[PDB]
């Protein structure tokens, strides 16, 4: 029952760093610092990182390394009653792959668009522009880069809404095909190749965040942007909303309990010091976010100073930052083509190995649970990525951004929080932090000190509950740029969200009906770990 291993410790480290370092480190954390009191936000952020964030990240890595099985079997062995957690996490990863790869497809589409002597989003004189186009962001106007992204890359304004996807843009579909070809030929042979491809995809982002940071800080007006980024306003941290933003950003940034770190740690040598790896990789996780915040805001300072654009207009999160505002800045600086190329390659590589993460979570879980497709990994992964492509054609339609945004909100946000809440409960209360401390001691040679036991037992479930309650308090029906989604689309969203979490109680009940005996005997038989 012995299994392959990483064939290199640095392959494990770089793979976990790759997965843990998403575009969200670039297009969310800097915006959160700007919005929520600048450098004062590093108090809520640092506290919520130390409490709950890293404890859950270390817990997941330790579970993965100890049980030597991917999510579905790991949870089925750890606490048979909660086996449904593995299927929930696999469904969530599966639903993420439909939408997340589209961001990489857009990054490649802009990368190929950058091979020109004059970047096409420079100006309003192109056939796709409207008379409401203006060179840069302004109130009551559309920026030239926004006109390019919406009306030429997405062609979104040719779609009435999510009921009207329109024609497939084959120039986008080809890019999404290239994305799935890269994912296939990296994942098909497993970690023997994935660990080597991450040596590119996990390290090129730091070549970019180096030379693009040097470009940033040398621009005129950079320091004004650093001031907007880090001017501390401790009056803000008195407001709970800042603590909810910090907690949710920590959770989704690290992605603890997502089943991907179970998959990656499962291939470690059993006596590998997983504690040192969890601390190293979460520290670089937040470090990279902070440095990417200087990368973003040095350029947003250059814009706010030199181009006259109002800072409130450019400082934004998500695709609007990286496909509108930041390339609109790149278009103006010397060697615009070079910075466009390396920037969009940075976004591509930030997305690629974060997508390898979810794909390897799926393929490990299903390999370990179903050997019929452990022996045929190549054919299975070809069928998986062919499914993701045939579905992703919907997200390459003219209306495709509406489908992307629907999944981006509903596909994973709420469901993974309740999945990881039941992970922390099953580990710390049903399995027991005593047993889990013996397991960690046997792996790495020392028990996790009382701090970690207190975090995993009490504070991690409160942390996750605080995150999910503030995501539900903050709920408002899905809307985008004065398109308000029909109620049937929000219903489909909640159905997609429920489809994963319903596995937890559905599988728990199915298990509780199949095991014999009286109810308490069934509970005991379903609580005894597989190794006991």
């Amino acid at each position, epitope marked *: 029952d012995e299994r392959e291993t990483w064939s290199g410790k640095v392959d494990f480290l770089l793979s976990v760093i790759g997965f843990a370092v998403d575009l969200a480190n670039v297009w969310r954390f800097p915006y959160l610092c700007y919005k929520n009191g600048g450098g004062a936000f590093l108090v809520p952020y640092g506290i919520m990182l130390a409490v709950g964030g890293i404890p859950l990240f270390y817990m997941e890595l330790a579970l993965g390394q100890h049980n030597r099985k991917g999510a579905i079997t790991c949870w089925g062995r750890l606490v048979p009653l909660f086996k449904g957690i593995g299927y929930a996490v696999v469904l969530i990863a599966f639903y993420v792959d439909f939408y997340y790869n589209v961001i990489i497809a857009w990054s490649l589409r802009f990368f190929f668009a950058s091979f020109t002597n004059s970047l096409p989003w420079t100006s309003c004189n192109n056939i796709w522009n409207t008379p409401n186009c203006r060179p840069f962001e302004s109130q009551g106007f559309q920026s030239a880069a926004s006109e390019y992204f919406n009306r030429y890359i997405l062609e979104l304004n040719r779609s009435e809404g999510i009921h009207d996807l329109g024609a497939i843009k084959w120039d986008m579909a080809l890019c999404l095909l290239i994305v799935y070809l890269i994912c296939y030929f990296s994942l098909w042979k497993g970690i023997s190749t994935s660990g080597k491809v991450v040596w590119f995809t996990a390290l090129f982002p730091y070549a970019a965040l180096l030379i693009l940071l040097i470009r940033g800080l040398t621009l005129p007006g950079s320091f004004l942007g650093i001031q907007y980024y880090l001017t501390p306003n401790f009056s803000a941290i008195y407001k709970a909303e800042v603590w909810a933003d910090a907690a949710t950003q920590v959770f989704f940034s690290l992605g603890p309990g997502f089943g991907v770190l179970l998959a990656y740690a499962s291939y470690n040598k059993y006596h590998n010091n997983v504690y040192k790896d969890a601390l190293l990789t979460s520290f670089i996780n937040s470090a990279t976010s902070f440095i990417a915040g200087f990368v973003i805001f040095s350029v947003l300072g250059y814009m706010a100073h030199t181009l006259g654009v109002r800072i409130e207009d450019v400082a934004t999160e998500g695709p609007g930052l990286v496909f509108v505002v930041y390339p609109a800045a790149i278009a103006t600086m010397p060697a615009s083509t070079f910075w466009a190329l390396i920037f969009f390659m940075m976004l591509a590589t930030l997305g690629l190995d974060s997508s390898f993460g979810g794909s390897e979570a799926i393929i490990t879980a299903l390999s370990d649970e179903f050997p019929k497709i452990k022996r045929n990994r190549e054919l299975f992964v070809a069928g998986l990525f062919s499914l993701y492509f045939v579905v992703g054609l919907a997200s390459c339609t003219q209306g495709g951004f509406y489908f992307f945004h629907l999944l981006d909100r509903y596909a994973a946000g709420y469901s993974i929080l309740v999945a990881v809440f039941f992970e922390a409960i099953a580990v710390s209360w049903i399995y027991g932090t005593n047993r889990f*401390s*013996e397991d960690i*001691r046997d792996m790495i*040679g*020392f*028990p996790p000190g009382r701090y970690w036991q207190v975090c995993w037992r009490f504070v991690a479930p409160i942390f996750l509950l605080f995150i999910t309650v503030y995501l539900l308090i903050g709920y408002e029906p899905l809307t985008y740029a004065d398109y308000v989604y029909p109620s049937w689309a929000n219903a489909l969203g909640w159905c997609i969200a429920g489809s994963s979490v319903v596995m937890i109680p559905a599988v728990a009940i199915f298990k509780l009906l199949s095991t014999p005996g009286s109810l308490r005997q069934r509970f005991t038989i379903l609580t005894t770990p597989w*190794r006991d």
Partner: antibody
Amino acid sequence: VQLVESGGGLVKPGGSLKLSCAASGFTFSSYAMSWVRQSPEKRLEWVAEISSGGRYIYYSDTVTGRFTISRDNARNILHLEMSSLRSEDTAMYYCARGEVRQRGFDYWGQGTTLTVSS
Amino acid sequence: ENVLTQSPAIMSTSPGEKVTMTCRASSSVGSSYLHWYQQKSGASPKLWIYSTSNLASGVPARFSGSGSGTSYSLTISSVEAEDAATYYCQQFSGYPLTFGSGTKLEMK
């Protein structure tokens, strides 16, 4: 903290015995105790180890299958059952506290002598 | 197995001499997992050094440990008649745990 062992004396070759170690002054439940024996030539030799909760057990190849380490987290007693004792088992057996591999056997019992002969 | 052999098997010193004793591992032992124990005649061993270097609680600073890999050493900067004990190295990195053959300081 102190550990004190009990049981020992004379056993016939091929006979059986149970050693015990009583733990006091620390929360016994959370420390992985070990047994270490000293031959009369004063060579130390690790015999067996038991984790905090008793779920991970290890033995040296010279003892495996003959002895059975055991633990009582309610009474704070550590045990070593012995079967098919041999002349080579004549030794002083030390209870050793041994929780953290990067600390070693930081506390030792008094030891009890065991001799195997007719 | 990972037998450890200590050298010398026996040693003798005047007080105030400086001496070194070595633990040789038949396989490489992580620097974090080699320990040294002191046993005085007629009493249980005590932990003395709990890595290459770290002195245990109550161990006098005259002792120091050094080296790594397959050759570990315990050093005494000034030997004192009040030790004159038997010292055993031990590896904790892999099972079975192996103590060294031990070495002894006899005061001249």
